[PDB]
Design an enzyme around this catalytic site. Structure first.
Site, PDB file in Angstrom:
ATOM      1  NE  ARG A  45     -42.645  16.412 -13.327  1.00 47.42           N
ATOM      2  CZ  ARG A  45     -42.642  15.715 -12.206  1.00 47.42           C
ATOM      3  NH1 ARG A  45     -43.448  14.674 -12.044  1.00 47.42           N
ATOM      4  NH2 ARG A  45     -41.802  16.087 -11.241  1.00 47.42           N
ATOM      5  CG  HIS A  49     -47.543  17.211 -11.603  1.00 50.25           C
ATOM      6  ND1 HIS A  49     -47.010  16.510 -10.548  1.00 50.25           N
ATOM      7  CD2 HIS A  49     -47.354  16.421 -12.687  1.00 50.25           C
ATOM      8  CE1 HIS A  49     -46.524  15.358 -10.971  1.00 50.25           C
ATOM      9  NE2 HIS A  49     -46.718  15.272 -12.279  1.00 50.25           N
ATOM     10  CD1 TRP A 188     -41.665   8.389 -22.708  1.00 50.77           C
ATOM     11  CD2 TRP A 188     -40.897  10.285 -21.840  1.00 50.77           C
ATOM     12  NE1 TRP A 188     -42.081   8.438 -21.400  1.00 50.77           N
ATOM     13  CE2 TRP A 188     -41.620   9.597 -20.843  1.00 50.77           C
ATOM     14  CE3 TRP A 188     -40.312  11.519 -21.523  1.00 50.77           C
ATOM     15  CZ2 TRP A 188     -41.792  10.074 -19.544  1.00 50.77           C
ATOM     16  CZ3 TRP A 188     -40.483  11.990 -20.235  1.00 50.77           C
ATOM     17  CH2 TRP A 188     -41.209  11.278 -19.269  1.00 50.77           C
TER      18      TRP A 188
HETATM   19  C1  HEM Z   1     -50.577   8.363 -16.613  1.00 54.40           C
HETATM   20  C2  HEM Z   1     -50.024   9.688 -16.642  1.00 54.40           C
HETATM   21  C3  HEM Z   1     -48.695  10.055 -16.397  1.00 54.40           C
HETATM   22  C4  HEM Z   1     -47.746   9.495 -15.553  1.00 54.40           C
HETATM   23  C5  HEM Z   1     -47.803   8.258 -14.669  1.00 54.40           C
HETATM   24  C6  HEM Z   1     -46.671  10.393 -15.572  1.00 54.40           C
HETATM   25  C7  HEM Z   1     -45.395  10.135 -15.025  1.00 54.40           C
HETATM   26  C8  HEM Z   1     -44.167  10.764 -15.304  1.00 54.40           C
HETATM   27  C9  HEM Z   1     -43.013  10.544 -14.570  1.00 54.40           C
HETATM   28  C10 HEM Z   1     -42.591   9.260 -13.868  1.00 54.40           C
HETATM   29  C11 HEM Z   1     -42.118  11.555 -14.957  1.00 54.40           C
HETATM   30  C12 HEM Z   1     -40.668  11.748 -14.486  1.00 54.40           C
HETATM   31  C13 HEM Z   1     -40.454  12.938 -13.576  1.00 54.40           C
HETATM   32  C14 HEM Z   1     -38.973  13.118 -13.193  1.00 54.40           C
HETATM   33  O1  HEM Z   1     -38.278  12.124 -12.994  1.00 54.40           O
HETATM   34  O2  HEM Z   1     -38.409  14.203 -13.331  1.00 54.40           O
HETATM   35  C15 HEM Z   1     -42.845  12.417 -15.745  1.00 54.40           C
HETATM   36  C16 HEM Z   1     -42.277  13.503 -16.460  1.00 54.40           C
HETATM   37  C17 HEM Z   1     -42.970  14.435 -17.249  1.00 54.40           C
HETATM   38  N1  HEM Z   1     -44.246  14.301 -17.645  1.00 54.40           N
HETATM   39 FE1  HEM Z   1     -45.620  12.967 -16.852  1.00 54.40          FE
HETATM   40  N2  HEM Z   1     -46.930  11.428 -16.373  1.00 54.40           N
HETATM   41  C18 HEM Z   1     -48.077  11.164 -16.995  1.00 54.40           C
HETATM   42  C19 HEM Z   1     -48.773  12.180 -17.676  1.00 54.40           C
HETATM   43  C20 HEM Z   1     -48.314  13.429 -18.153  1.00 54.40           C
HETATM   44  C21 HEM Z   1     -49.044  14.257 -19.003  1.00 54.40           C
HETATM   45  C22 HEM Z   1     -50.578  14.147 -19.142  1.00 54.40           C
HETATM   46  C23 HEM Z   1     -48.193  15.342 -19.253  1.00 54.40           C
HETATM   47  C24 HEM Z   1     -48.443  16.661 -19.655  1.00 54.40           C
HETATM   48  C25 HEM Z   1     -49.312  17.159 -20.697  1.00 54.40           C
HETATM   49  C26 HEM Z   1     -46.983  15.041 -18.626  1.00 54.40           C
HETATM   50  C27 HEM Z   1     -45.779  15.732 -18.822  1.00 54.40           C
HETATM   51  C28 HEM Z   1     -44.504  15.387 -18.389  1.00 54.40           C
HETATM   52  C29 HEM Z   1     -43.321  15.989 -18.805  1.00 54.40           C
HETATM   53  C30 HEM Z   1     -43.122  17.199 -19.706  1.00 54.40           C
HETATM   54  C31 HEM Z   1     -42.317  15.367 -18.059  1.00 54.40           C
HETATM   55  C32 HEM Z   1     -40.820  15.670 -18.131  1.00 54.40           C
HETATM   56  C33 HEM Z   1     -40.388  16.747 -17.123  1.00 54.40           C
HETATM   57  C34 HEM Z   1     -38.893  17.122 -17.232  1.00 54.40           C
HETATM   58  O3  HEM Z   1     -38.242  16.714 -18.180  1.00 54.40           O
HETATM   59  O4  HEM Z   1     -38.378  17.463 -16.180  1.00 54.40           O
HETATM   60  N3  HEM Z   1     -47.053  13.860 -17.990  1.00 54.40           N
HETATM   61  N4  HEM Z   1     -44.071  11.913 -15.988  1.00 54.40           N
END
Ligand code: HEM
Length: 291
Positions: A45, A49, A188
């Site tokens: 992430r 970002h 997920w």
């Molecule tokens: C429309 C695009 C996306 C939206 C709106 C979005 C939104 C979210 C949100 C709401 C979270 C939760 C963060 C938290 O509560 O800790 C998150 C987590 C994360 N996302 Fe995204 N994201 C998207 C795209 C991506 C993509 C493109 C990747 C990376 C290749 C990514 C990787 C991750 C991962 C790995 C997490 C989990 C982080 C952890 O477990 O702490 N995301 N995302």
């Protein structure tokens, strides 16, 4: 606005493999973070970002400059939670102070995916730290409470097409949402620290219910205990996205390949590579090294 890659002086593959290893070893040892999920997901992430701020129109943002290290970017509310990935990497930067911020943040993302049994991601060195005044303003990362049209449109600014967008969201179904962080709660899928195509499968085969969470936000909930963001769920609403979701659910390898290409492109957006620059590195995993 041109950003030319400049290899850190005299370093080569071995140098970076050293840096890989260090990250991979600490991933292995600091295993209890986030209820024993580990730091893998937060590292990818973080790499997304810092790359996701890029704007193809004027070549601002993107991973080149390592500006996440400045307060403005570090304190972007969309980056809530990423502080933990930063602090993870901090000891390693200290150990390898010759690597640039941008190279370390993007290699952290490559290392995590490979170590979590994802595909190999070729990587290129040469990002160069730029001054605080190059930091992009808050607001270029996507919202989660929107639809397919939103998603498609957003990603156009990163020169990503539909297939690329669907491969990137899939993202091995890693880690989870945290209410304190994003106002969303839950994972997920069942394997949150193994890179898989489970997200596509879950999306198509779970029974989703549209509910409101304690942060008073709607999300899709499954009886299995999984969740989807509105933007995630939109991938099966759109007829073009849906077809790709079904392709990745039915072909593990295709998905693996597609993601690898998109993730590298994502990490490399905005950077100019001299013809004389080295070829991309492919790092071996700890496992492949017997470490
Ligand atoms: C429309 C695009 C996306 C939206 C709106 C979005 C939104 C979210 C949100 C709401 C979270 C939760 C963060 C938290 O509560 O800790 C998150 C987590 C994360 N996302 Fe995204 N994201 C998207 C795209 C991506 C993509 C493109 C990747 C990376 C290749 C990514 C990787 C991750 C991962 C790995 C997490 C989990 C982080 C952890 O477990 O702490 N995301 N995302």
């Amino acid at each position: 606005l041109v950003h030319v890659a400049s290899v850190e002086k005299g370093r080569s593959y071995e140098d970076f493999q050293k840096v890989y290893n260090a990250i991979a070893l600490k991933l292995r040892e600091d295993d209890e973070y986030d209820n024993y999920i580990g730091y893998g997901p937060v590292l990818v992430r973080l790499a997304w970002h810092i790359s996701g701020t890029w704007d193809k129109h004027d070549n601002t943002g993107g991973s080149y400059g390592g500006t996440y290290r400045f307060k403005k970017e570090f304190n972007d509310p969309s980056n809530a939670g990423l502080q933990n990935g930063f602090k993870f990497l901090e000891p390693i930067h200290k150990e390898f102070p010759w690597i640039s911020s941008g190279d370390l943040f993007s290699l952290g993302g490559v290392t995590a995916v490979q170590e979590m049994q994802g595909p190999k991601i070729p990587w290129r060195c040469g990002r160069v730290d730029t001054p605080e005044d190059t930091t992009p303003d808050n607001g270029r990362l996507p919202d989660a409470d929107k639809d397919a049209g939103y998603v498609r449109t957003f990603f156009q600014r990163l020169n990503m097409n539909d297939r690329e967008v669907v491969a990137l969201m899939g993202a091995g179904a890693l880690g989870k949402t945290h209410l304190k962080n994003s106002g969303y709660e839950g994972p997920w899928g069942a394997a949150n620290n193994v890179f898989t195509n489970e997200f596509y499968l879950n999306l198509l085969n779970e029974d989703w219910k549209l509910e409101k969470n304690d942060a008073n936000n709607e999300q899709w909930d499954s009886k299995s205990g999984y969740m989807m963001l509105p933007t995630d769920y939109s991938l099966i609403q759109d007829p073009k996205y849906l077809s790709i979701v079904k392709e990745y659910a039915n072909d593990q390898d295709k998905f693996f390949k597609d993601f690898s290409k998109a993730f590298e492109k994502l990490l490399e957006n905005g950077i100019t590579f001299p013809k004389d620059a080295p070829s991309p590195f492919i790092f071996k995993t700890l496992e492949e090294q017997g470490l």
